[PDB]
Amino acid sequence: VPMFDIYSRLLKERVIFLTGQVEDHMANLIVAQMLFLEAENPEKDIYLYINSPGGVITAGMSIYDTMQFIKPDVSTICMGQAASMGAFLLTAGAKGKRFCLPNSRVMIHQPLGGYQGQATDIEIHAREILKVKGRMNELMALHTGQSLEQIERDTERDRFLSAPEAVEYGLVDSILTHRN
Amino acid sequence: VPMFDIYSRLLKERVIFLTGQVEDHMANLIVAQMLFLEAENPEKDIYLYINSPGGVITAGMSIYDTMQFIKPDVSTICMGQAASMGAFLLTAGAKGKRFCLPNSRVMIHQPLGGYQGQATDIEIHAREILKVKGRMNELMALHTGQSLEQIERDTERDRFLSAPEAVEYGLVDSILTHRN
Amino acid sequence: VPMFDIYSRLLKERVIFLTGQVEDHMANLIVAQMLFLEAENPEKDIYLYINSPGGVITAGMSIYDTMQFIKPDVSTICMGQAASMGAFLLTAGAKGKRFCLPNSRVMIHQPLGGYQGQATDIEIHAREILKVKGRMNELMALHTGQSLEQIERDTERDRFLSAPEAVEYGLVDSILTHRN
Amino acid sequence: LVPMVFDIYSRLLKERVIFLTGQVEDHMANLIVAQMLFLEAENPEKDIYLYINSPGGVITAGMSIYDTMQFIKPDVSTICMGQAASMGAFLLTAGAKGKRFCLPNSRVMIHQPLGGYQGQATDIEIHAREILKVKGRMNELMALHTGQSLEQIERDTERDRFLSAPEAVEYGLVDSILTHRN
Amino acid sequence: VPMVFDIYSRLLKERVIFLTGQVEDHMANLIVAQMLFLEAENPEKDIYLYINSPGGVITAGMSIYDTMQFIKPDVSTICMGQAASMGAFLLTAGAKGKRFCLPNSRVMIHQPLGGYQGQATDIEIHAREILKVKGRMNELMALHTGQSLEQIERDTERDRFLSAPEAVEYGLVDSILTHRN
Amino acid sequence: VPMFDIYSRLLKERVIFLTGQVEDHMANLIVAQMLFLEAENPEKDIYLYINSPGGVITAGMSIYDTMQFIKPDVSTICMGQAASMGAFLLTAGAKGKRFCLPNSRVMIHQPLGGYQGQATDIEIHAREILKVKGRMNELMALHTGQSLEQIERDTERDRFLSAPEAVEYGLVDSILTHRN
Amino acid sequence: LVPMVDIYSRLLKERVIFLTGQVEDHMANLIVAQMLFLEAENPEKDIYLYINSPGGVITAGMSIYDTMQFIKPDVSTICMGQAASMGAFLLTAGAKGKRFCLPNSRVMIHQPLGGYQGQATDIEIHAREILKVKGRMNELMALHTGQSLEQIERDTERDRFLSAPEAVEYGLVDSILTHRN
Amino acid sequence: VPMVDIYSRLLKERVIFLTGQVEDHMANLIVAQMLFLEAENPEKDIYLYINSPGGVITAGMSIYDTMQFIKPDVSTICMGQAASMGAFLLTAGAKGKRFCLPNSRVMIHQPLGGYQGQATDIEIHAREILKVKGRMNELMALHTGQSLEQIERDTERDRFLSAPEAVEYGLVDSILTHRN
Amino acid sequence: VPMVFDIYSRLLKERVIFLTGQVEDHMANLIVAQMLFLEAENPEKDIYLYINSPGGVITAGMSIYDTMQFIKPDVSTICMGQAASMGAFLLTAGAKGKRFCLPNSRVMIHQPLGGYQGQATDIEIHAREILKVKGRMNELMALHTGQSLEQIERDTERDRFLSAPEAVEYGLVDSILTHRN
Amino acid sequence: DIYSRLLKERVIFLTGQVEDHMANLIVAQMLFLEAENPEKDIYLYINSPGGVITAGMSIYDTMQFIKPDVSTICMGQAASMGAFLLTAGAKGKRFCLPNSRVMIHQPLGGYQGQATDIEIHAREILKVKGRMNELMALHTGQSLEQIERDTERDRFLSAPEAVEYGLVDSILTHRN
Amino acid sequence: DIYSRLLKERVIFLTGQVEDHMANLIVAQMLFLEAENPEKDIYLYINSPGGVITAGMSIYDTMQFIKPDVSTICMGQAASMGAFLLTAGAKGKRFCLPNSRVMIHQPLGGYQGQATDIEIHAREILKVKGRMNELMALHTGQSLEQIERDTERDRFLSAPEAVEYGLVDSILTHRN
Ligand SMILES: CC(C)(C(=O)NCCSc1ccccc1C(F)(F)F)P(=O)(c1ccc(C(F)(F)F)cn1)c1ccc(C(F)(F)F)cn1
């Protein structure tokens, strides 16, 4: 990692990178960077680049709730891909400030999970992932402006969206083409 | 491998052994041995020893359905232990002809299972193991003579029964102790 | 394996066993027995017991065409479970001679596959698994009496059937309960 | 690598913020305990802020954080982020009353202690008694912090039980929901 | 194995041989030895070769091929589950008129696969070899199917599946085998 | 690691290195580098050395879209090799500022991929990788000046380019041999 | 995995011995044992040794070679699939006029491979020995093929493939075998 | 392989095979065979084919002492190779009846050993392998008619002998070439 | 590593770069980075590249080689220990007149090594490509040694060791450094 | 940086298995010391079982090339290449500590491949053995023949025996 | 840093198994300390089960050779070479803590190869065992005969037992 090191200087310009699989510890680092920037200045926008194939729902939810919680607007920019929990956090950005780069791609689907144990415990845990599915679809509908029923239909199986399609789906607000 | 071998010669006396973990192939051996003894003589009792920790539920139901289908009474004898599907196949024997040896032990509990994938598939497979729990419990009421909601409670967790409690429970009819 | 071995002894009664995963070498053994049984007496029914979770499609189809090609009717009996390709070969028995036991279950779904390579290669194998899915669904519709659409809608995701449901669906013609 | 501003987690310690993240075990808990003492040392009056995102973990390790939280002069305010299961739910409900929060989409799981032993029957009895004594006390400390009766906590912890943020408020595990900063 | 002689032994005295699974030296040698035995036992009756194979080692397949062409008996081939690559090749190499697909078998054909490791000089020796192997396999297939060598070349560059009807139309087999007479 | 290391020192002169496999994390660091240099001087050229055999397409597209978006020209110099995604990122520098060293080579082909699962899902991901192949060829045709179908035939299979043939093909503009 | 009537045993009654797979001491000893036994059964009748091998251990192979020359009966060798390296040597080692290739079989010849680990002094002892075995192989190869020593040397420095026809014109084998007459 | 049993039938002609690594169990097999052929006719010759890289010394000496002990002369035939303890049992056959096939080769050397532990125990074991080295060289001098000192000088390092050389050295009496 | 700045960073101030061990992409890049920094620091003062290497990835070496010829300053190559294959190639590629062995270093040359696995068609592609690489390697070799391309071809078919004097005599290096001059 | 401080006293440590990267870090320290001062001695401490010859030769040629006299001090052991580099110190400056031990033997090697390549690589290791022997004779003042006779097998020398043999010059026991 | 900081107070820690690289670290710290002040005592805390003999001997020859006395202090355990280096300290300046323990025994070893080589390496470990036993007798004041009767098998000495044996000079109980 080349020399403030490269990421930490970009953090001074309110830039945060979410990269790779979503799990607790990289999630916590994003949360901490957001909380830190809100302290440095609750008025200025935060920029979160998202290149991710997805990952742990509860961990992405910590970034989501931090995203809504803090004062600053969190702008999202998708480069490479934003899949599943990655696509969910991209559309979670402040309305009007969610972006895809021209050849970034997006994928949405339904929650994934797995359990082993007794029938009683399996029902508990299956009941809970369905509640998570419903919560995601609602939040998904809310950020995209699609109906709940459109989210449900379209996430039952993997659905890919090009950058233009994700603009037209309401997942992002526009494409970043070149700096003016 | 003591010797025409010791199990095949024991089979000549209508004696079938269900040892160890219950799965598709060992269960198939027993299905075939029962079919064969039935072909030899539909009148005579068949003796099914059971020293088993349990195992795959559908594998066991292939034995259960075969026991109930074939004309001969299938007598069951618990030596060692009959746990989970082992207990089930022991109480499935012809009423009056189900026996624990003096120190054999019995354990009953609910189906174990699990699966991983999309929420929608998790739901389908949770539903299914719940349906199985229901049937298994119904079928246990049938054979032991206890109320459905008694079985449901006695098997939510691991529940041991000594040979006496297993008779008093309805699982077996009597204890074997000394040949007459 | 008990002793003439037990499976050989029941071959004499024109009973074949399909147990466990469908793959080439076990499927081959099953085919070899059908050809033998037909060469012994092309007019008598053959009895195929099925307890399997499914397996390789081409291996399963090899059994299927043999069942149809040979002179005898092939009666299919499901014990334990007949899943995926096991459900297919179950329903492919002689019309009117297809049976579930009271407590066996059936499950149906669409083909599984997978491949790695260049986009062009992926396309060739993807086209092929869809054709196979097409063929399987057509045959399922033929053997159950259900519309092609019904089959396709019901096989996108794993669907379970109790023995009663398997009869009401056209997978089997009746339940075997006791030997009359 | 960690971004620097002081790495990121050190700067947020200045504002008296501490993250509990991932599996609870001895060294990550001892890290948290050490921060809680530092904070109490740097200012015995100001509040400490403990972010919890955890599936739980080793009970004795969690109980080291817990006793530190009660022992210290500072009120410790806990904030659930993605999830607080098992020892994490316990430590969440253990923060200063009125200062325990769920983020709107965090979730809480409660259940009973896991464990087990291997050895002679005589020793199996000792270790079974111990985990039963532990389960008894934990139930009591959950009843105390949540406000639920001891019997209720028992019924509800025999099996896994999920609570959303609002249900966690209604249950007494947390006090309110943090939705937008004021 | 199930007795009646195990069941393959029983179908061997009816001149049925089973090519099943991957093609390699030892299963291929086993098929060759069955043909020679069936040829000794009666060189005037046909041999029945059931093929359910995904392919395998080319030189092991060619010991089966040369043995079918060599022995006096005709070798009739029936493809039951799949016959892919070397599997398809041995299927199409049966006695003309006596090559069948069961109705739901499939066939796949393509070009040789291989691999070498070592010095440039030996890489070239081996690369040139497999190209020649390719040229002979394409020739034998054209011969047995009646396609032009050029057609065989086009259709084997990449994997190509043929259903049982399509195989009949391609020349790869002679008839489908539906219900026994 | 000869250290403020040597790459940080080369960064000062707007020299970025792309070495080895393309993947999310080395790709993210090149994007962070590119962004940092724009912020320094959004007018001064940036130089990307490419010595790579390829890697994950979406990770390369994260770098590709960053090159086009940022205000500065990105000059691409290939040393050693630019294979697959590496060729793509090479041909994607500024027209006129794309170089090969004398004995470096270039290799181009089509997307490689692999999915497994249900036939329906195989179709979705097969269809996505074909979309990816088409959009890759379009941008390949756009940056080299060849036609969509010339790129299409030349990329069905692995195709090697000497540094002269790279120039002739429009993959790069010229060859650096000695420093002026 | 075998059929009974056992199949290779039955083919042994026709004086047919099989050399499949990699040459190593134990598979080789099995072939010497069948050769010795077949001699004792009748020292005048030929022996048929079908060869489909990539090669293998030299000494293990030399144990089949010397058995072949030692025994009274002629050992006719037949290549099916491939006879590579030690496999090829044993092919061309058959009785003169009775070594055959099947039409699409193939043959590859090269030089001894080995390796050693140890002290310089011991490295020399073993390197010399593998060079001496290389010299004895090229000689016995020059003998059985009718080629000069120098030609065998040049042609085996690196891997060299021979089609069935090129093997006949090289002296490895006497003639191809297309159909049972 | 080939039960027709090929090794059993050659044993009836008094032929024993020593193949592969010399260890207690295969050597016990050779001993058991020699014992049996003595008990069958203590006067006819026995024929030990040797193709062997050597092996454990005490395992081998059990074969050696059995060869001298039994009334029958044990003719030895090297075939392929006889190295180390293979060479020793080769030359240990009956005088005038030790043969090499023309292209067999022999290798001789001193014993190999390995020990770990306390210095006091290392001495006890190093003393022992020197004793075993002295005895082996002695016996080897006695069967080759070479001096002890010549044997000692030649076995310090690996020495290869061809079939003729092994005759010249006295390890075998002559070369079998063609059956008379 | 010892600090002094660490020992290698300190020798970089004296314009000394170390090429140690297997040649692969990341160690090659650090070498290229170093040379870009040394030219920038002073486009005229010589660069000293110590080489002790058994070889490695050709494209990775070729990134070093082309960086060496592009940059303005002369690159002086000092062999110590061993320069084998691509390491030999990079040592003889230093500034003409300034390529050295130390007295007991040894050099080894041979032809490219590679390996492919796949369809026959792609095997053709990659075998052609490695023959293309072998030719240019031989050509750049002859250029830097002065030997005829034919001589290079004959002497790199197999591993060929050269002592320090032999490498001087061959054109690989220009002289030997024995004691300090 | 304890080795860095000790480096300031012109002390370089040869520890453990000899291979390319540690040899190269050995060479880099010797060049740095020469540049810091070409007239002062360097002290190379050796505690090694040996290792890769070409790696040791890169250390050996550097010791001869650089201007400073490289004194060698054996502690623990110097076996095989470790003892070659010990005997290659500046004459009169090669030291054993009282309870170090020295082991000389012959090159070890191994190849796999074609017989032609086996002969190529075996010829080479015999060439290496001769030059190892040549240089061993050179620094100990024994004859090539004596060295060839003494190194065919493992051979242990104690500090006194290492002085008699010529491998080292004397024994350090206590600091004067 | 905590260990660097205790090194400034002339304290080195010998902890765990004795092998080449941890032993080199110890030797480097001793030469560093001797240079920093060749007149001031060095303190060596030993908590170790033993380990490689030649590595241990490089420590041992450094302790003897350098100017400063090396006072050794046993903490936890000093077994085998651990015990050897503990009795290696300056007479009068070797300590045990009250509840530390000490184990002595003979050298352990292992070779594999030709008989002639086994003899060579077997001979050498016996020489090593002689010198080891000779040095121990020296440092403990016991007779040679006593040391080897006592070390032929594992022998445990408590702190008072090791004072009485001559392995260390006194016990440390509380700071004064
Ligand atoms: C990128 C380029 C600036 C470059 O790497 N300089 C490295 C020197 S950094 C530097 C500079 C000033 C002060 C201090 C420093 C340092 F180092 F102390 F920090 P360049 O010189 C180059 C290109 C290719 C190669 C090779 F060998 F890999 F092929 C090599 N060098 C270059 C030249 C020409 C062009 C044109 F004309 F084509 F546009 C573009 N780029």
mmCIF file of N, CA and C and ligand atoms in Angstrom, chain F residues 6-17 45-49 75-79 96-102 174 176-180, chain I residues 32-42 63-64 66-72, ligand 1:
data_model
loop_
_atom_site.group_PDB
_atom_site.id
_atom_site.type_symbol
_atom_site.label_atom_id
_atom_site.label_comp_id
_atom_site.label_asym_id
_atom_site.label_seq_id
_atom_site.Cartn_x
_atom_site.Cartn_y
_atom_site.Cartn_z
ATOM 1 N N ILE F 6 9.607 2.780 -2.765
ATOM 2 C CA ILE F 6 9.987 3.171 -4.110
ATOM 3 C C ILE F 6 8.755 3.466 -4.957
ATOM 4 N N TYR F 7 7.683 2.688 -4.803
ATOM 5 C CA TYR F 7 6.478 2.974 -5.573
ATOM 6 C C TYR F 7 5.891 4.324 -5.194
ATOM 7 N N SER F 8 5.809 4.617 -3.894
ATOM 8 C CA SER F 8 5.393 5.947 -3.469
ATOM 9 C C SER F 8 6.244 7.016 -4.133
ATOM 10 N N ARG F 9 7.543 6.748 -4.287
ATOM 11 C CA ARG F 9 8.421 7.695 -4.963
ATOM 12 C C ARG F 9 8.078 7.801 -6.443
ATOM 13 N N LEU F 10 7.788 6.670 -7.093
ATOM 14 C CA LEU F 10 7.366 6.712 -8.486
ATOM 15 C C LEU F 10 5.978 7.331 -8.625
ATOM 16 N N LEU F 11 5.111 7.130 -7.629
ATOM 17 C CA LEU F 11 3.809 7.782 -7.650
ATOM 18 C C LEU F 11 3.949 9.290 -7.826
ATOM 19 N N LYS F 12 4.910 9.901 -7.110
ATOM 20 C CA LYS F 12 5.167 11.342 -7.194
ATOM 21 C C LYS F 12 5.282 11.827 -8.633
ATOM 22 N N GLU F 13 5.856 11.005 -9.507
ATOM 23 C CA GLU F 13 5.969 11.328 -10.916
ATOM 24 C C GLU F 13 4.835 10.751 -11.735
ATOM 25 N N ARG F 14 3.690 10.474 -11.099
ATOM 26 C CA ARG F 14 2.481 10.044 -11.798
ATOM 27 C C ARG F 14 2.716 8.732 -12.535
ATOM 28 N N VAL F 15 3.419 7.811 -11.884
ATOM 29 C CA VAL F 15 3.677 6.493 -12.446
ATOM 30 C C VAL F 15 2.959 5.475 -11.573
ATOM 31 N N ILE F 16 1.966 4.791 -12.138
ATOM 32 C CA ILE F 16 1.260 3.719 -11.439
ATOM 33 C C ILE F 16 1.650 2.390 -12.077
ATOM 34 N N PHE F 17 1.709 1.338 -11.259
ATOM 35 C CA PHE F 17 2.046 -0.011 -11.719
ATOM 36 C C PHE F 17 0.861 -0.952 -11.541
ATOM 37 N N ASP F 45 -0.483 14.241 -17.226
ATOM 38 C CA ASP F 45 -0.688 12.858 -17.632
ATOM 39 C C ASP F 45 -0.282 11.890 -16.530
ATOM 40 N N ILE F 46 -0.921 10.717 -16.542
ATOM 41 C CA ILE F 46 -0.610 9.599 -15.655
ATOM 42 C C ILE F 46 -0.099 8.440 -16.494
ATOM 43 N N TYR F 47 0.858 7.693 -15.954
ATOM 44 C CA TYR F 47 1.441 6.574 -16.678
ATOM 45 C C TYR F 47 1.190 5.279 -15.923
ATOM 46 N N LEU F 48 0.499 4.366 -16.593
ATOM 47 C CA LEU F 48 0.146 3.054 -16.080
ATOM 48 C C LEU F 48 1.043 2.022 -16.765
ATOM 49 N N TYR F 49 1.953 1.427 -16.007
ATOM 50 C CA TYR F 49 2.672 0.261 -16.492
ATOM 51 C C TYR F 49 1.809 -0.974 -16.304
ATOM 52 N N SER F 75 -1.653 7.283 -19.767
ATOM 53 C CA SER F 75 -0.777 6.618 -20.724
ATOM 54 C C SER F 75 -0.494 5.197 -20.247
ATOM 55 N N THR F 76 -0.644 4.233 -21.145
ATOM 56 C CA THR F 76 -0.427 2.831 -20.823
ATOM 57 C C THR F 76 0.825 2.333 -21.529
ATOM 58 N N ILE F 77 1.730 1.734 -20.750
ATOM 59 C CA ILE F 77 2.968 1.111 -21.222
ATOM 60 C C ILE F 77 2.913 -0.343 -20.806
ATOM 61 N N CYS F 78 3.031 -1.242 -21.772
ATOM 62 C CA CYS F 78 3.055 -2.665 -21.499
ATOM 63 C C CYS F 78 4.500 -3.146 -21.469
ATOM 64 N N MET F 79 4.882 -3.816 -20.373
ATOM 65 C CA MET F 79 6.154 -4.528 -20.282
ATOM 66 C C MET F 79 5.922 -5.954 -19.799
ATOM 67 N N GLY F 96 -2.873 7.685 -28.846
ATOM 68 C CA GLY F 96 -1.580 8.315 -28.990
ATOM 69 C C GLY F 96 -0.612 8.064 -27.852
ATOM 70 N N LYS F 97 -1.090 7.560 -26.711
ATOM 71 C CA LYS F 97 -0.269 7.435 -25.515
ATOM 72 C C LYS F 97 -0.272 6.006 -24.977
ATOM 73 N N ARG F 98 -0.387 5.032 -25.888
ATOM 74 C CA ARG F 98 -0.440 3.606 -25.576
ATOM 75 C C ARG F 98 0.766 2.915 -26.203
ATOM 76 N N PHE F 99 1.600 2.294 -25.375
ATOM 77 C CA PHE F 99 2.920 1.849 -25.798
ATOM 78 C C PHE F 99 3.139 0.374 -25.506
ATOM 79 N N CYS F 100 4.036 -0.205 -26.287
ATOM 80 C CA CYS F 100 4.610 -1.508 -26.022
ATOM 81 C C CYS F 100 6.121 -1.372 -25.958
ATOM 82 N N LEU F 101 6.730 -2.161 -25.087
ATOM 83 C CA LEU F 101 8.169 -2.324 -25.123
ATOM 84 C C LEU F 101 8.506 -3.399 -26.153
ATOM 85 N N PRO F 102 9.745 -3.419 -26.666
ATOM 86 C CA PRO F 102 10.038 -4.264 -27.842
ATOM 87 C C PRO F 102 9.642 -5.717 -27.726
ATOM 88 N N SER F 174 2.453 2.950 -30.460
ATOM 89 C CA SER F 174 3.813 2.735 -30.948
ATOM 90 C C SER F 174 4.613 1.928 -29.927
ATOM 91 N N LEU F 176 8.058 1.946 -27.526
ATOM 92 C CA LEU F 176 9.224 2.581 -26.911
ATOM 93 C C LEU F 176 10.382 1.602 -26.954
ATOM 94 N N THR F 177 11.517 2.016 -27.514
ATOM 95 C CA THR F 177 12.719 1.187 -27.495
ATOM 96 C C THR F 177 13.862 1.794 -26.696
ATOM 97 N N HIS F 178 14.217 3.057 -26.939
ATOM 98 C CA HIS F 178 15.214 3.752 -26.134
ATOM 99 C C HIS F 178 14.669 5.094 -25.667
ATOM 100 N N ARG F 179 15.228 5.566 -24.561
ATOM 101 C CA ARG F 179 14.816 6.883 -24.032
ATOM 102 C C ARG F 179 15.467 7.983 -24.871
ATOM 103 N N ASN F 180 14.693 9.005 -25.213
ATOM 104 C CA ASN F 180 15.183 10.145 -25.985
ATOM 105 C C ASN F 180 16.191 10.953 -25.175
ATOM 106 N N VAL I 32 12.411 -3.227 -11.980
ATOM 107 C CA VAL I 32 12.107 -2.164 -12.947
ATOM 108 C C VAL I 32 11.894 -0.828 -12.238
ATOM 109 N N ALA I 33 11.072 -0.831 -11.187
ATOM 110 C CA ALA I 33 10.879 0.365 -10.376
ATOM 111 C C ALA I 33 12.214 0.965 -9.966
ATOM 112 N N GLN I 34 13.094 0.132 -9.416
ATOM 113 C CA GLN I 34 14.420 0.583 -9.013
ATOM 114 C C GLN I 34 15.163 1.239 -10.172
ATOM 115 N N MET I 35 15.116 0.637 -11.365
ATOM 116 C CA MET I 35 15.870 1.202 -12.480
ATOM 117 C C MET I 35 15.270 2.518 -12.951
ATOM 118 N N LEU I 36 13.939 2.620 -12.952
ATOM 119 C CA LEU I 36 13.303 3.893 -13.286
ATOM 120 C C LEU I 36 13.714 4.984 -12.308
ATOM 121 N N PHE I 37 13.796 4.643 -11.019
ATOM 122 C CA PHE I 37 14.200 5.614 -10.005
ATOM 123 C C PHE I 37 15.668 6.003 -10.148
ATOM 124 N N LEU I 38 16.533 5.050 -10.528
ATOM 125 C CA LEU I 38 17.960 5.352 -10.650
ATOM 126 C C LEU I 38 18.252 6.215 -11.875
ATOM 127 N N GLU I 39 17.552 5.971 -12.992
ATOM 128 C CA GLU I 39 17.682 6.840 -14.160
ATOM 129 C C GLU I 39 17.212 8.247 -13.839
ATOM 130 N N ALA I 40 16.021 8.360 -13.261
ATOM 131 C CA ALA I 40 15.493 9.658 -12.872
ATOM 132 C C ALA I 40 16.473 10.413 -11.997
ATOM 133 N N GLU I 41 17.023 9.731 -10.991
ATOM 134 C CA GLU I 41 18.022 10.328 -10.113
ATOM 135 C C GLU I 41 19.226 10.834 -10.896
ATOM 136 N N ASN I 42 19.611 10.121 -11.941
ATOM 137 C CA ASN I 42 20.750 10.536 -12.742
ATOM 138 C C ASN I 42 20.784 9.726 -14.030
ATOM 139 N N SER I 63 10.310 -8.008 -19.106
ATOM 140 C CA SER I 63 10.049 -6.672 -18.571
ATOM 141 C C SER I 63 11.332 -6.037 -18.043
ATOM 142 N N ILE I 64 12.185 -6.828 -17.377
ATOM 143 C CA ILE I 64 13.472 -6.319 -16.897
ATOM 144 C C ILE I 64 14.375 -5.993 -18.078
ATOM 145 N N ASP I 66 13.742 -5.211 -21.238
ATOM 146 C CA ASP I 66 13.383 -4.032 -22.017
ATOM 147 C C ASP I 66 13.563 -2.767 -21.195
ATOM 148 N N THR I 67 13.261 -2.819 -19.894
ATOM 149 C CA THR I 67 13.569 -1.668 -19.056
ATOM 150 C C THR I 67 15.061 -1.364 -19.095
ATOM 151 N N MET I 68 15.900 -2.407 -19.107
ATOM 152 C CA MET I 68 17.347 -2.197 -19.141
ATOM 153 C C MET I 68 17.771 -1.456 -20.399
ATOM 154 N N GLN I 69 17.213 -1.836 -21.555
ATOM 155 C CA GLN I 69 17.606 -1.221 -22.814
ATOM 156 C C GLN I 69 16.945 0.132 -23.033
ATOM 157 N N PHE I 70 15.754 0.349 -22.477
ATOM 158 C CA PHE I 70 15.086 1.633 -22.662
ATOM 159 C C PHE I 70 15.817 2.740 -21.925
ATOM 160 N N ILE I 71 16.131 2.515 -20.652
ATOM 161 C CA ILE I 71 16.593 3.604 -19.810
ATOM 162 C C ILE I 71 17.932 4.124 -20.318
ATOM 163 N N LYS I 72 18.188 5.406 -20.036
ATOM 164 C CA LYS I 72 19.412 6.041 -20.549
ATOM 165 C C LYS I 72 20.664 5.424 -19.948
HETATM 166 C C1 LIG L 1 6.430 7.384 -17.300
HETATM 167 C C2 LIG L 1 7.783 8.084 -17.196
HETATM 168 C C3 LIG L 1 7.643 9.572 -16.840
HETATM 169 C C4 LIG L 1 8.613 7.401 -16.107
HETATM 170 O O1 LIG L 1 8.345 6.314 -15.708
HETATM 171 N N1 LIG L 1 9.763 8.099 -15.569
HETATM 172 C C5 LIG L 1 10.545 7.446 -14.537
HETATM 173 C C6 LIG L 1 11.349 8.553 -13.860
HETATM 174 S S1 LIG L 1 10.426 9.197 -12.423
HETATM 175 C C7 LIG L 1 11.143 10.793 -11.850
HETATM 176 C C8 LIG L 1 11.042 11.880 -12.717
HETATM 177 C C9 LIG L 1 11.555 13.114 -12.349
HETATM 178 C C10 LIG L 1 12.172 13.285 -11.113
HETATM 179 C C11 LIG L 1 12.278 12.214 -10.239
HETATM 180 C C12 LIG L 1 11.761 10.956 -10.579
HETATM 181 C C13 LIG L 1 11.930 9.798 -9.539
HETATM 182 F F1 LIG L 1 12.101 8.577 -10.164
HETATM 183 F F2 LIG L 1 13.038 10.033 -8.740
HETATM 184 F F3 LIG L 1 10.831 9.718 -8.713
HETATM 185 P P1 LIG L 1 8.736 7.870 -18.782
HETATM 186 O O2 LIG L 1 9.968 8.653 -18.642
HETATM 187 C C14 LIG L 1 9.116 6.067 -19.102
HETATM 188 C C15 LIG L 1 8.293 5.357 -19.973
HETATM 189 C C16 LIG L 1 8.556 4.010 -20.239
HETATM 190 C C17 LIG L 1 9.651 3.395 -19.619
HETATM 191 C C18 LIG L 1 9.980 1.906 -19.883
HETATM 192 F F4 LIG L 1 11.342 1.710 -19.885
HETATM 193 F F5 LIG L 1 9.406 1.083 -18.934
HETATM 194 F F6 LIG L 1 9.491 1.562 -21.117
HETATM 195 C C19 LIG L 1 10.426 4.182 -18.769
HETATM 196 N N2 LIG L 1 10.152 5.462 -18.532
HETATM 197 C C20 LIG L 1 7.844 8.403 -20.329
HETATM 198 C C21 LIG L 1 8.615 8.749 -21.427
HETATM 199 C C22 LIG L 1 7.992 9.140 -22.594
HETATM 200 C C23 LIG L 1 6.607 9.157 -22.610
HETATM 201 C C24 LIG L 1 5.883 9.583 -23.878
HETATM 202 F F7 LIG L 1 6.709 10.393 -24.606
HETATM 203 F F8 LIG L 1 5.650 8.455 -24.600
HETATM 204 F F9 LIG L 1 4.699 10.213 -23.566
HETATM 205 C C25 LIG L 1 5.889 8.784 -21.486
HETATM 206 N N3 LIG L 1 6.525 8.417 -20.393
#
